[PDB]
């Protein structure tokens, strides 16, 4: 009887100084399509460009 469910560190570390857990961003991430290092990184190139 296993529910192999991922635990959002955010949902086990309410220490605001270093883990934006703002309910508001609590959902922007849910909205996002599974990332990656390449994309997280690519946004940076683009957000910055």
């Amino acid at each position: 009887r296993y529910h192999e469910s991922v635990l959002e560190i955010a949902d086990i570390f309410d220490q605001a100084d270093f883990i934006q857990t703002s309910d508001a961003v609590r959902q922007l991430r849910a909205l996002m399509p599974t990332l990656s290092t390449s994309q997280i990184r690519h946004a940076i190139e683009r957000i910055a460009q």
Partner: protein
């Protein structure tokens, strides 16, 4: 004395396309950013947003 509907956009004049934001449709919408990987021709919009 005619107006029909009065939405509350997001002041297009401030978020000029110098912020790469194509705001017409209703919502923001930058082009190349947190794009998903490995998907058909479209699919790059559920989150273009």
């Amino acid at each position: 004395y005619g107006a029909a509907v009065v939405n509350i956009d997001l002041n297009r004049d401030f978020f000029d396309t110098a912020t790469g934001i194509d705001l017409t449709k209703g919502i923001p919408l930058v082009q190349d950013l947190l794009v998903p990987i490995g998907v058909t021709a479209g699919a790059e919009q559920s989150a273009e947003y």
